């Protein structure tokens, strides 16, 4: 065959906890166009893989990753194919490069039959999250063909400025997350809405301060913004995009329900075994991993797992495993991919550290125990963002993981790509 969406009845996997190394990563970073050069950071990475195709994005800067000079943004798509080694790999088919790379932010790719549609924000004020009041909401869609054609005009690459956004009570909406899904001919991108603190409806009584002696009932609401006195709060959700409508292009915002509400954060909606799952980064006090089956897409309500083993590093005020309401904006994005719904086994990369972004560990886990895991790097390895998508290769469950790591071999912060087969047997 080739590489397919994880759906139907795939090959069995060890379902029992073992400490022996039965996962062996394969490095496939040479397949993406990360051309190293001394003194250039490569950040804002994006990875999506749907139906045997994939989307990837990065921005390479000269010097620092924060204050470096934006050199080049690239958005690309291709096929995920067998190397020959029965090991899945990325092969680029189509890459777009905007003329001004410092203008494009928070891209998000959703696959639909012939293309990857990549929704991005356009800003002349920097990151909208850190310059919310000055950002004039402006959105773009880069549509890229996964199989380019010879003499096709704009079939290969079409840019679209968005001009009609329905956003309810929110002032501004923006894509916020690596990848989205399709339902029929409708696309859903992970997104965030900016709502003024003054119009935010929230009863402080809902803040669970009960077994937290040093937590004030005001903390949840204060933590709905990137600082306690921020003009806006942020609310996760989806940007819906119905392709059947045709004509010109309407994006509608769907807010997330307030069950286990945390601050708007990079999120992912994906499809697994024939129904949608949602991951949301933990960017505040609620640090245990937030993911689960989507119950309704519109309105958006997630059946969050009660997961007690996976978390993320933080800073002094909301470090890993913190559970008490604090006023903080900190954490990392480390998603997971459900690979077995009946047992709720997921696979993902977590940073095995409390207040430091390091030690990427690929792990297969249920709600209350990690079944088996393996490091992806040495034990002082700087690493922050991880995107994990899983699929079938001749019916074997594989997972590809992007990790933004500090590479000591080049002395450079950049993304790396791993392939990991989920093993069937539990011994050696």
């Amino acid at each position, epitope marked *: 065959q080739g590489v397919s969406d994880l759906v139907g009845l795939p090959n069995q996997i060890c379902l029992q906890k073992t400490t022996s190394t039965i996962l062996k990563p394969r490095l496939i970073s040479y397949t993406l166009p990360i051309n190293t050069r*001394e*003194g250039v*950071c490569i950040t804002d990475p994006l990875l999506a893989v749907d139906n045997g195709f994939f989307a990837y994005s990065h921005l390479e800067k000269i*010097g*620092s*990753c*924060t*204050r*470096g000079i934006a050199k080049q943004r690239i958005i690309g798509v291709g096929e995920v194919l067998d190397r020959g080694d029965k090991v899945p790999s990325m092969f680029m088919t189509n890459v777009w490069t905007p003329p001004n790379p410092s203008t494009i932010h928070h891209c998000s790719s959703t696959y639909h039959e012939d293309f990857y549609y990549t929704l991005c924000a356009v800003s002349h004020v920097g*990151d909208p*999250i*850190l310059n919310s009041t000055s950002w004039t909401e402006s959105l773009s869609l880069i549509r890229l063909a996964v199989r380019p054609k010879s003499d096709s005009g704009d079939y290969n690459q079409k840019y679209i400025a968005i001009t009609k956004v329905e956003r309810g009570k929110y002032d501004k909406v923006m894509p916020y997350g690596p990848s989205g899904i399709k339902q029929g001919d409708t696309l859903y991108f992970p997104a965030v809405g900016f709502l003024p603190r003054t119009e935010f409806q929230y009863n402080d009584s809902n803040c669970p301060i009960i077994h937290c002696k040093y937590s004030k009932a005001e903390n949840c609401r204060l933590s709905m913004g*990137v600082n306690s006195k921020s003009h806006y709060i942020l609310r996760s959700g989806l940007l819906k995009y119905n392709l059947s409508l045709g004509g010109d292009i309407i994006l509608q915002f769907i807010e997330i329900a307030d069950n286990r509400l945390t601050i708007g954060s990079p999120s992912k909606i994906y499809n697994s075994l024939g129904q949608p799952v949602f991951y949301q980064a933990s*960017y505040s006090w609620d640090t245990m991993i937030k993911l689960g089956d989507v119950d309704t897409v519109d309105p958006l309500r997630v059946q969050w797992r009660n997961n007690s083993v996976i978390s*993320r*590093p*933080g*800073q002094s005020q909301c470090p890993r495993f913190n559970v008490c309401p604090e006023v903080c*904006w*900190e*954490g*990392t994005y480390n998603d997971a991919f459900l690979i077995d719904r009946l047992n709720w086994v997921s696979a993902g990369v977590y*940073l095995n*550290s409390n*207040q*430091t*972004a390091e030690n990427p560990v690929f792990a297969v886990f249920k709600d209350n125990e990690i079944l088996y895991q393996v490091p992806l790097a040495e034990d*002082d390895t*700087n*690493a*922050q963002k991880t995107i994990t998508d899983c699929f079938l290769l001749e019916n074997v469950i594989w997972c590809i993981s992007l990790v*933004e790591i*500090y590479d000591t071999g080049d*002395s450079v*912060i950049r993304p790396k790509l791993f392939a990991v087969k989920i093993p069937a047997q539990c011994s050696e």
Partner: antibody
Amino acid sequence: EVQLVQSGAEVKKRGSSVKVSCKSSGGTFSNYAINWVRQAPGQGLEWMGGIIPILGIANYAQKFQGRVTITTDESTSTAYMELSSLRSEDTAVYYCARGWGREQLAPHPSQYYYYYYGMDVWGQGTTVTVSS
Amino acid sequence: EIVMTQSPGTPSLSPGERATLSCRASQSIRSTYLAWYQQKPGQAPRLLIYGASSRATGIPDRFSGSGSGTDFTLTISRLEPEDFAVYYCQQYGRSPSFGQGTKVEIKR
């Protein structure tokens, strides 16, 4: 081999400022870090701050935050340390020293950290005496 | 905001003896962020050990470093005359800081 050659001795009045320099002389700063380390007479070494010139960024020990600025002229391959509001406590030998320096992903949505590693190339030091 | 404290204050040893110096951290640190320096009077310091055990380039075999967490140790297997100097430990990373120093002195 590189050599860090520092500026000459200084005698500064109570309350003034001083700007020691350190020139790289035999290789540039390329992606290393320049640290500044002072030593009062009879006393021990004390890290003041550092700069990583290939990035923009400079970092300081809390004790010196506000009083110390560290800069570079990357073209002439030179680093500077400016200490203001000087007092008798600042009478010391001020060393300039090179090592690895590195930007680090932080467990934060926007912040980054900066690590200064061990210092293997040292300048000869600059004595500065604060007296009236 | 990490403090390094050094011991002994001032040991007296003889050429050919073995010196072992100790450095204690006010809080746990990864081994990879510990360094040892040497300083003779009227001279700059020179790096001896880094990453808590790796000898700097050009440094004789008799120098070796060890320890972890809170406690680290520098060992001169057999002293030469030029080894009688001051030794500083240092933790580095986001805000490096030095120990207060240990002077190794000739015994008679």
